[PDB]
Amino acid sequence: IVEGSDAEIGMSPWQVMLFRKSPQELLCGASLISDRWVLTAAHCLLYPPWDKNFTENDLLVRIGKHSRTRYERNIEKISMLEKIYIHPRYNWRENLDRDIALMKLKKPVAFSDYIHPVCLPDRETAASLLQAGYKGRVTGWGNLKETGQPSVLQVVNLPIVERPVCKDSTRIRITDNMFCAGYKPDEGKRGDACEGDSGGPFVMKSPFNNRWYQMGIVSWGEGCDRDGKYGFYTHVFRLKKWIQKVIDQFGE
Amino acid sequence: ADCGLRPLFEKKSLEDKTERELLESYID
Amino acid sequence: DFEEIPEEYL
Ligand SMILES: Cc1cc(OC[C@H](C)Nc2ccncc2)cc(C(=O)N(CCC(=O)NC(C)(C)C)C(C)C)c1
Ligand SMILES: [Ca+2]
Numbered sequence: 001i002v003e004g005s006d007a008e009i010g011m012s013p014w015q016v017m018l019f020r021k022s023p024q025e026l027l028c029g030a031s032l033i034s035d036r037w038v039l040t041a042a043h044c045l046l047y048p049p050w051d052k053n054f055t056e057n058d059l060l061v062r063i064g065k066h067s068r069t070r071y072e073r074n075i076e077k078i079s080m081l082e083k084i085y086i087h088p089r090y091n092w093r094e095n096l097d098r099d100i101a102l103m104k105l106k107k108p109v110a111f112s113d114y115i116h117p118v119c120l121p122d123r124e125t126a127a128s129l130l131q132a133g134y135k136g137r138v139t140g141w142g143n144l145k146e147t148g149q150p151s152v153l154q155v156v157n158l159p160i161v162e163r164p165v166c167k168d169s170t171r172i173r174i175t176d177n178m179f180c181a182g183y184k185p186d187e188g189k190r191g192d193a194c195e196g197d198s199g200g201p202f203v204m205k206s207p208f209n210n211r212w213y214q215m216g217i218v219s220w221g222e223g224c225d226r227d228g229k230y231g232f233y234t235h236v237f238r239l240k241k242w243i244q245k246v247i248d249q250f251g252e
Numbered sequence: 253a254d255c256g257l258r259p260l261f262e263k264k265s266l267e268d269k270t271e272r273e274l275l276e277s278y279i280d
Numbered sequence: 281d282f283e284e285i286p287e288e289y290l
């Protein structure tokens with residue numbers, strides 16, 4: 001996260017770290033949506049142009065963390081993956097359209113003060129909150145600058161941007177399964193996701209029921225925190241039929 | 253179902269340092 | 281840079 005700040009303890013208890021087993025490193029963010037299911041970006045797991053194609057036994061999930069690099073004894077929980085599901089129509093060749101994946105854990109994780117699932121939006125939620133100017137929150141352990149790494153989880157609040165401005169900021173073809181967020185150059189405030197934040201959640205707190213909803217997944221960007229560029233996010237509600245199909249077919 | 257309600261914040265009626273910025277953007 | 285995690289999870 002560029003130009004964010006340190007999270008508070010327990011501020012994002014649905015935050016998940018995807019951790020490569022060997023060599024031990026941050027791969028991506030993710031989010032906890034139930035005791036056995038983790039949501040991330042497909043490009044965290046599959047992106048052939050950069051020779052990325054991870055299998056279940058290549059990774060671990062670390063839940064309840066705050067510190068990036070430390071083993072947070074008696075707080076974090078580490079889970080193995082039973083199976084990865086990538087959207088069958090994930091468009092890695094062009095624009096990461098439908099940039100979404102699910103991971104089923106081998107065993108259910110116990111919830112705690114530090115470990116708790118986020119809500120997924122329904123149609124009405126999305127309609128009420130996915131509006132230009134409305135702000136969401138992005139969290140992660142990724143880089144602090146485009147060109148270093150944080151000691152603890154970083155957090156930044158960013159406004160959803162008007163779709164014509166999103167489209168006019170890039171040469172990449174945007175789809176209805178994406179939205180963009182960030183400040184404009186004339187707005188003076190700054191902030192973005194960056195390398196290692198991919199897959200993490202874009203959340204909004206409903207003013208109707210006081211609950212946090214995951215509206216987005218950190219998807220692609222061109223640089224990080226560049227004037228006149230915006231980060232792009234997978235539109236979770238638009239892909240929820242797929243989420244529900246997978247969990248109804250394969251959940252326990 | 254208690255999704256999206258944080259143990260150290262909503263469950264104890266404590267606000268985090270910047271959630272009000274989100275609420276203030278939710279204008280209309 | 282990352283602290284070793286318990287053997288049990290590897
Ligand atoms: C896998 C991947 C990831 C990526 O961004 C990851 C990056 C960490 N994501 C964000 C950064 C800042 N804010 C929000 C998100 C950006 C890209 C990317 O560059 N793309 C374009 C690739 C491409 O066509 N490049 C040229 C050079 C051939 C035009 C995608 C497919 C849109 C690919
Ligand atoms: Ca364009």
Ligand code: NA
Nearest residue numbers: 225226228229
């Ligand atoms: Na920008």
